């Protein structure tokens, strides 16, 4: 029931972190799929 903490987290998660972490580290991987 942590919707009070995850409320603002939807601002830096699917918005910022999506392209931030899934683009900085990876470059020639994604071999799992």
């Amino acid at each position: 029931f942590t919707d009070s903490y995850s409320r603002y987290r939807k601002q830096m998660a699917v918005k910022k972190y999506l392209a931030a972490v899934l683009g900085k580290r990876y470059k020639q991987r994604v071999k799992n799929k």
């Binding site: 029931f1 919707d3 998660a13 699917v14 972190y17 972490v21 580290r25 071999k31």
Partner: protein
């Protein structure tokens, strides 16, 4: 060619190790008839403990700047858990946190 071993998506032993304790938490639970939810789950990058109804668990990797040794719980992915079960990944998956990567930095 048809079936791959998937060395990238192996998450060390964390796959079988975490799913083993979740199986114990599955039949033992601890919600009963008051605050129901999911009995636990294991994804392609992080471990999920038994959540409640309408719970969005955001689990990130230890040290987003120094991702070296992967213990457990990586890639901050918020998956909801209603009465129907588990929802869809959001942020989406597609290799969230880089733990099996080479030079993750820069």
């Amino acid at each position: 060619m048809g079936s791959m071993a998937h060395s990238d998506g192996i998450f060390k032993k964390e796959q079988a190790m975490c799913l083993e304790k979740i199986q114990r938490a599955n039949e033992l639970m601890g919600f009963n008839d008051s605050s129901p939810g999911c009995p636990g789950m294991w994804d392609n990058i992080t471990c999920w403990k038994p959540a409640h109804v309408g719970e969005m668990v955001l689990v990130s990797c230890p040290e987003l700047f120094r991702i070296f040794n992967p213990d457990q719980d990586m890639g901050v992915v918020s998956r909801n858990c209603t009465e129907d079960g588990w929802s869809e990944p959001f942020p989406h998956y597609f290799d969230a946190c880089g733990f099996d990567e080479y030079e993750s930095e820069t």
